[PDB]
Each structure stands twice: as C-alpha cells, then as structure tokens.
Amino acid sequence: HHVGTNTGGVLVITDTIIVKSGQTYDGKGIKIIAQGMGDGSQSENQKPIFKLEKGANLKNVIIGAPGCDGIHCYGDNVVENVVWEDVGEDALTVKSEGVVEVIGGSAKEAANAVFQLNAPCTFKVKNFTATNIGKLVRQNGNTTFKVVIYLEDVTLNNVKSCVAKSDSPVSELWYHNLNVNNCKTLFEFPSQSQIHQY
Ligand SMILES: O=C(O)[C@H]1O[C@H](O[C@@H]2[C@H](O)[C@@H](O)[C@@H](O[C@@H]3[C@H](O)[C@@H](O)[C@@H](O)O[C@@H]3C(=O)O)O[C@@H]2C(=O)O)[C@H](O)[C@@H](O)[C@H]1O
Ligand SMILES: [Ca+2]
Ligand SMILES: [Ca+2]
Ligand SMILES: [Ca+2]
Ligand SMILES: [Ca+2]
Ligand SMILES: [Cl-]
C-alpha cells in the first residue's frame, strides 16, 4: 500500500472543486474540509464538495466532516478510493445520465442516503464498505426512469432503512458478494423480482 504523497495534509476549501471532462482529480491521499458550503445536516441547500462534469474522474481523497452535498456526478465518471469520513446530506449524487462507478473507498455516518440517483444511469459500487447509514442507494423518490445498480464486493454494517430503494418498476439492482449486517430490510423496490444476483 503506497499511501499517497499528500497524506497528512488538509486542504480547506471554500467553494466546490470542478473537475472537467476528461480530467482526473487525484488527491494523492489529501483530506478535504469544506467551509461555508454546508454543515452536513439533512438540509437540501448545501454545496457539493466536488462537481464531476461528464467524463471527469476523481481519486484518492478523504472527505472530512462536514460532508456538505458530497460529490455531484454528471455521468461517465470513475470515483476511486474516495473515503467519506462523515457523509453529509448524501455522499454522491448522479445528476445526469451515464455510467458512474464507485470503486474502493468507504463511507460512514450517513443520516439518510449514501448514493442518490436523480437521472437514468448505470451505477456500480465495487470493493466498498459503509457503516451507520440509512440507505446505500436511493433512486429519487417517485421517479420512474430506469437505473441499473450493481453492488459488487460491498460490505454494509448498520443500515437503518434498507440497502436500496426505488419507486421505479423498470429499475434493477444486481449484486455479487454483498455482505450486510444489521439491516432493517434489504430492498424496497416495487417488486422483489427487480433484484438479482450474478
Ligand atoms: O438529490 C437530493 O438530495 C434529493 O433529496 C430529496 O429526495 C430524497 C429522496 O429521493 C426522496 O424520496 C425523499 O426520501 C424520503 C424522505 O423525505 C427522507 O427523509 C427519508 O426518510 O427517505 C424517504 C424515502 O427514501 O422515501 O427525500 C430524500 C431526502 O430527503 O434526501 C429531495 O426531495 C430531492 O428533490 C432531491 O433534492
Ligand atoms: Ca436526505
Ligand atoms: Ca437529499
Ligand atoms: Ca443531496
Ligand atoms: Ca453524517
Ligand atoms: Cl434512510
């Protein structure tokens, strides 16, 4: 394990970091603390720590409290080795269509959702651990567009509500090596047949 060269530094930001199409923000292990951008509560008016334009990537950051509105993904994004020490309103939101992959990293202390899917997308969570969360994934309530969610090598502990929840009959969730401890219910979808193993 080559810990990153920014390990032990703390970057204090006062505005959202915008990552551009085709760019990769590599924190090299930096911890980020956002100020004036939200308190990490459930209020819906906080700023994202990062905005990933379509085709932007992010890797190797620690997001400290306050988690604000987390990471906003506009599609075709890879988010690797991101650690949310204390999820804010939500950890990451898919805002526009495309494939979004969360690979590695972890999240803790999500009062409500970790991942919030507000546009049709393919959403994959791989090699990920989350602890003390309300939900891992929420498709925006009362929407009926299609998401396809993959949970692969995912370990969850203390899930207050459910692993994932969608109000869309056409959405699907697929899982493979999913470990869940202390969870109220696994899936809240219109029908359980929308959930598959692979
Ligand atoms: O992108 C966002 O942050 C998103 O947040 C709100 O919606 C989510 C969710 O999509 C809604 O279904 C709703 O969730 C329900 C409750 O209001 C919530 O407190 C918790 O109990 O879960 C419920 C559920 O899953 O059905 O509200 C969510 C939230 O409060 O984060 C916005 O309504 C939405 O417009 C958007 O900003
Ligand atoms: Ca919420
Ligand atoms: Ca919300
Ligand atoms: Ca949010
Ligand atoms: Ca929190
Ligand atoms: Cl919840």
UniProtKB/TrEMBL annotation:
Top-rank taxon: Bacteria
Residues noted as binding Ca(2+) 5 in the record, renumbered to the chain: E172
Keywords of the record: Calcium, Lyase, Membrane, Metal-binding, Secreted, Signal, Transmembrane, Transmembrane helix
Extent of the signal sequence: none
Positions that bind alpha-D-galacturonate 3: K108, N118, G141
Family label: Belongs to the polysaccharide lyase 3 family.
Protein name: pectate lyase
Lineage: Bacteria, Bacillati, Bacillota, Bacillota incertae sedis, Caldicellulosiruptorales
Full-sequence range covered: 268 to 460 of 460
